[PDB]
Amino acid sequence: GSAVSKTVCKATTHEIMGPKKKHLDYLIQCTNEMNVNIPQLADSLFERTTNSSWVVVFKSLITTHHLMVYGNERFIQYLASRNTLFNLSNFLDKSGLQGYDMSTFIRRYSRYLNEKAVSYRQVAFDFTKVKRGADGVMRTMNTEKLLKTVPIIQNQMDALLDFNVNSNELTNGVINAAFMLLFKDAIRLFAAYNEGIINLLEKYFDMKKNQCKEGLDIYKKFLTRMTRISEFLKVAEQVGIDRGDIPDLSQAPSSLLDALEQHAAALE
Amino acid sequence: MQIFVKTLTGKTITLEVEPSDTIENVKAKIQDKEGIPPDQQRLIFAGKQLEDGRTLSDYNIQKESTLHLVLRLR
Secondary structure, three states: OHHHHHHHHHHOOOOOOOOOHHHHHHHHHHHHOOOOOHHHHHHHHHHHHOOOOHHHHHHHHHHHHHHHHHOOHHHHHHHHHOOOOOOOOOOOOOOOHHHHHHHHHHHHHHHHHHHHHHHHHHHOOOHHHOOOOOOOHHHHOOHHHHHHHHHHHHHHHHHHHOOOOOHHHOOOHHHHHHHHHHHHHHHHHHHHHHHHHHHHHHHHOOOOHHHHHHHHHHHHHHHHHHHHHHHHHHHHHHHOOOOOOOOOHHHOOOOOHHHHHHHHHHOO | OEEEEEEOOOOEEEEEOOOOOEHHHHHHHHHHHHOOOHHHEEEEEOOEEOOOOOEOHHHOOOOOOEEEEEEOOO
């Protein structure tokens, strides 16, 4: 309890480095123990986003992101239930040149964690942690849920690509640590997105005339997002990331629009 | 000749054919290389589902053309 709040502060010192593994692994340990005051923990991290240093604020967001990905699901569930999550729409650290540069990136990253939280609330599971493959969640979803679900994947994606950082702006250990977590979410979210699309394209040719309209707009959007995902993956390539970890987007079903349009034409 | 078949999961198949081979025969050869029962194979080219009795030449499928395979429910 007193130890939690103190490890939160250790994760979020003014040291210009990402949160330390020892403090992040302890916090993960916390979330999983039986009598955790999850609200109190979350509360301590929000409190550190009220701070005026960009270093503190951005490391508190990174820790929260880290804990949504690796912490007990109970942590992401609480964040998604809250009324207000991160209120950093006006954040600005005028202290120096780094503060000025890193304040736009704090505003964007805070927006992305809020969307991640809303995404979880709207479908009640984490797109980046559900069973993959031909019997996974997104491949086997039934038609109604699929059509309501794939748009929520797309809105999370869009908020991730809005961080919109160039490789030559990843100039300190804080923003890089955020970047690497954004990268991890992106490839897992794209995997969930490509899988929903596969399913959609399979079902499309037995769908009703007005489900093909919903599905056709989902797909058109999938194609525009893929051009922007490839730009983000080029930043990843530039920074030096293992190229076997970058998805090959040429494998996505990206050339079927014509088939989907002629088939909607025939349905009229 | 050589044609390609791209599945929705991303694999690209290479198949040996002749322009006269029926779409039904082309599906049977996809059975032989990938295991997919022909009755679950939608083949698509130039935006149209390809009919079993028509031939590759009836659809303008020549060398190095890529067909799309979409799996279907019986």
